[PDB]
Amino acid sequence: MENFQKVEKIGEGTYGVVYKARNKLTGEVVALKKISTAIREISLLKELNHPNIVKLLDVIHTENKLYLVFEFLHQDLKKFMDASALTGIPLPLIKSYLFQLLQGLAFCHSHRVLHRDLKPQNLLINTEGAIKLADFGPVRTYTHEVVTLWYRAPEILLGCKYYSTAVDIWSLGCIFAEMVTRRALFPGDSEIDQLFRIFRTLGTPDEVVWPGVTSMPDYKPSFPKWARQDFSKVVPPLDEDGRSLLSQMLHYDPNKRISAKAALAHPFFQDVTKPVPHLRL
Numbered sequence: 337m338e339n340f341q342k343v344e345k346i347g348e349g350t351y352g353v354v355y356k357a358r359n360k361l362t363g364e365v366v367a368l369k370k371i372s373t374a375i376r377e378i379s380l381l382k383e384l385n386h387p388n389i390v391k392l393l394d395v396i397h398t399e400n401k402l403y404l405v406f407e408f409l410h411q412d413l414k415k416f417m418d419a420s421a422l423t424g425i426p427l428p429l430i431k432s433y434l435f436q437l438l439q440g441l442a443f444c445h446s447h448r449v450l451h452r453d454l455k456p457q458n459l460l461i462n463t464e465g466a467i468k469l470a471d472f473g474p475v476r477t478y479t480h481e482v483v484t485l486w487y488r489a490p491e492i493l494l495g496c497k498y499y500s501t502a503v504d505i506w507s508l509g510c511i512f513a514e515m516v517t518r519r520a521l522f523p524g525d526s527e528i529d530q531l532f533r534i535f536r537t538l539g540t541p542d543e544v545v546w547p548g549v550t551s552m553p554d555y556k557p558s559f560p561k562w563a564r565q566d567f568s569k570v571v572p573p574l575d576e577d578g579r580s581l582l583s584q585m586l587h588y589d590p591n592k593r594i595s596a597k598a599a600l601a602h603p604f605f606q607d608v609t610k611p612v613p614h615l616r617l
């Protein structure tokens with residue numbers, strides 16, 4: 337740790353604080369997260385190297401603290417969306433970012449690694465048009481964030497403890513809808529409000545669309561029964577290729593939900609390109 341100099345605080349989580357830091361004996365600018373089974377599960381993340389995954393450079397265990405050293409990126413997608421809120425991110429750039437994240441997930445998922453907590457703030461962007469997955473899934477000062485449950489898959493909210501890679505596809509579908517509309521798809525402020533916001537839009541799930549849903553640990557037969565609203569209302573003015581892909585990413589049944597690998601073949605990406613975003617750093 338004596339090999340690093342703090343420059344500023346760049347973030348916070350339930351169990352850690354993140355700083356922008358400088359490596360004294362290499363000159364590298366990194367992001368440093370300060371926090372036996374964990375030491376091994378995080379050492380496996382060091383081998384999960386892909387152009388669309390923020391590089392985990394090192395793991396340092398020093399005097400009852402764990403430090404994670406990552407490659408530094410200047411902006412996150414949440415800030416870029418907040419900065420593009422009045423104009424909207426151009427469709428070619430939304431498509432490029434979605435494609436790149438599906439490539440990163442196809443990679444993680446093939447190595448049996450789930451992210452579990454995809455949200456705009458852990459999607460980092462650079463000046464080259466790249467987007468990368470960060471912070472693969474207590475400090476008393478951590479401030480509760482409005483967006484915390486907004487991207488949670490319904491199986492997680494329904495108490496499934498052995499959920500699959502499909503939970504990441506759900507979170508990315510929510511992010512895709514948000515880039516298009518400039519508003520959060522399911523802005524829930526509690527587990528039940530999050531569940532009911534999903535139900536209000538996609539219809540209350542039942543055994544027809546999600547076999548086994550009524551046997552989930554937190555499923556209650558007393559949940560109000562909302563009709564599925566027609567999908568053209570959910571992400572206007574996104575085209576039919578985009579709406580079709582999004583509907584597949586938001587299927588209730590995790591087994592019907594499109595995989596990252598199949599999503600890359602979707603006709604929506606036939607004209608995918610890699611535009612350069614305009615970033616003000």
Ligand SMILES: COc1ccc(F)cc1-c1ccnc2[nH]c(C3=CCN([C@H]4CC[C@H](CC(=O)O)CC4)CC3)cc12
Nearest residue numbers: 346354367369406407408409410411415457458470471
């Ligand atoms: C999500 O990423 C992580 C999570 C855990 C972790 F351990 C490391 C990383 C991580 C890895 C690599 N590179 C990174 N870069 C960054 C940020 C760079 C600048 N962001 C800005 C500051 C200014 C704000 C506006 C204002 O406050 O005025 C608008 C947002 C914050 C986040 C975080 C981060």
